[PDB]
Amino acid sequence: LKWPRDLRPLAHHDLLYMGQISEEDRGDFNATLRNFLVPRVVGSQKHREVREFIVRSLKDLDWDVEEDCFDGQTPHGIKPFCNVIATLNPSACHRLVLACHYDSLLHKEGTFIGATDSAVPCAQLLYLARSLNGKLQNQKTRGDGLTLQLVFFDGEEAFERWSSHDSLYGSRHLAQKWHEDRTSAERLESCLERSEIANQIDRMEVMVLLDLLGAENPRFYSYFGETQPVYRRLVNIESRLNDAGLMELPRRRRRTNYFSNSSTVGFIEDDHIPFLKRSVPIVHIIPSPFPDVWHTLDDNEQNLHHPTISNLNKIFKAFVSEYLQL
Numbered sequence: 001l002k003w004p005r006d007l008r009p010l011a012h013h014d015l016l017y018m019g020q021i022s023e024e025d026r027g028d029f030n031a032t033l034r035n036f037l038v039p040r041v042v043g044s045q046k047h048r049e050v051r052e053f054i055v056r057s058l059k060d061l062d063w064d065v066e067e068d069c070f071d072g073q074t075p076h077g078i079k080p081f082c083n084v085i086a087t088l089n090p091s092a093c094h095r096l097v098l099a100c101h102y103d104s105l106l107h108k109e110g111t112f113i114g115a116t117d118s119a120v121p122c123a124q125l126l127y128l129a130r131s132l133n134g135k136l137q138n139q140k141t142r143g144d145g146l147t148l149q150l151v152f153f154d155g156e157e158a159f160e161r162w163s164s165h166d167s168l169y170g171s172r173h174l175a176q177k178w179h180e181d182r183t184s185a186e187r188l189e190s191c192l193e194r195s196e197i198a199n200q201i202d203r204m205e206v207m208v209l210l211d212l213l214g215a216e217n218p219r220f221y222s223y224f225g226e227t228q229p230v231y232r233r234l235v236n237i238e239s240r241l242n243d244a245g246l247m248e249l250p251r252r253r254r255r256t257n258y259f260s261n262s263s264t265v266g267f268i269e270d271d272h273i274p275f276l277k278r279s280v281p282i283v284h285i286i287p288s289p290f291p292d293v294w295h296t297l298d299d300n301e302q303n304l305h306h307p308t309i310s311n312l313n314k315i316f317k318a319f320v321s322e323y324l325q326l
Contacts, residue, residue: 003229004192005094005146005205010237010322018318019246021310029127029313032057036119037301039111040104042079042155050102050122051082054152057126058086061133063150068177072169075160076106083170084152086129089140092147093191096323097207098125101156101170101271105295113300116291118156120214120309125150127313128320135326145190146205148324153271168271175201175274204280206230209272211286212294213312216305218287219257221264224276227283228263230323234283235259237318246314248307256311264288 010018040047051067058065068083084102087095100121104114113119129136129150136148155169178200185191188203196202206227212218222231241247242255249256272282293299320326 004194007229007233007322008325010240010318014321014326015237015240015318016244016246018321019241019244019314021314025131025313026310028130029123029309032126032130033119033123036102036122037113037115039113040102040119041106042081042103042157042159047103051084051152051154054084054086054102054122054126058084058129058150061129062137063088063129064090068170068174070173072155072173074169075166079155079159079169081154081169081173083154083174084150085174086150086152087147088136088149089147089189091189092140093145093185093188093195093197093203094205095147095149095203096320097149097151097204098128098210098320099151099153099207099271100125100210101153103154103157103170105157106159107295107297109297112295112297115300115304116212116214116293117295117299118211118213120304121210122152124210124213124309124313124316125152128316131317132320132326135321136324139324139326143190145188145192146324148320149204151207156271162269167269168273171271172274175278175280178204179278201275201278201280204275206281206283207272207275208283208285209270211270211284212290213285213287214304214309215287215291215293216308217258218291218308218312219289220259220285221262221266221288223263223266223268223284224282225263227281230281230283231259232261233322234285234315234319235261237322238315241311241314241318247311250307258312258315
């Protein structure tokens with residue numbers, strides 16, 4: 001079946017512009033990232049400070065920001081959780097949703113930063129909102145029924161052994177909340193003609209979930225045939241950026257190959273699961289294999305690979321620009 005929205009290839013001018021990273025761009029991203037490179041344990045002061053920083057950053061950009069807060073039972077007793085949902089144009093029927101988790105694992109061995117997991121994704125979402133703000137604010141005026149939404153999930157990590165009941169606290173909560181919140185196309189602005197809207201979850205046109213990003217040479221695959229048309233845009237954008245010589249490589253005459261033009265047989269549990277189960281199309285931007293530092297105390301700032309992060313930022317900026325026709 002065809003994707004419900006016609007995907008217009010990015011004009012060369014826009015590809016080149018989105019594929020630019022200046023010294024001011026690097027500095028802004030790095031300043032943003034520094035705010036996340038702290039332990040973010042559920043219920044802790046630093047976790048609250050990170051949430052407040054996300055919320056303030058997006059409110060300052062004139063986004064609608066909801067703090068979806070609740071208490072949930074865990075193997076460590078009752079815990080507070082707060083998802084952050086930022087929506088550029090609340091009234092727009094359809095949302096391109098970009099997401100990640102902002103909590104960090106309570107690690108048995110000691111202080112755990114979770115730099116890839118998911119401090120970098122968090123910073124990338126805020127960087128997108130900041131770097132594209134002018135274009136996003138212009139797009140919001142169009143009345144085209146499409147907008148950008150950023151979701152920062154709380155409580156992705158298990159407190160003890162990962163299980164259906166101990167993991168994905170924020171995403172399970174939000175998916176259920178939105179699924180049970182009934183609405184219809186008539187209540188919303190400019191829904192696509194053949195849309196079936198019965199609840200808030202139906203407004204998530206596609207959820208692009210970023211996780212475990214920041215290590216060198218990640219390998220992505222299309223995890224869902226349903227979103228192959230969207231995934232293939234990431235493949236294409238990466239190819240075009242390489243052809244134009246806009247990717248950072250350590251030697252001349254190399255290419256990045258992050259987005260494999262294949263699917264893989266791999267089952268990964270993550271914040272998309274509660275949405276997938278409710279028919280939200282998913283693009284899961286998570287590497288396979290996971291970074292070598294995964295869930296070790298070495299998942300820290302110095303083990304990040306900055307040229308890779310820069311390259312990913314170019315792909316993501318170009319992707320959002322293409323999808324929203326910025």
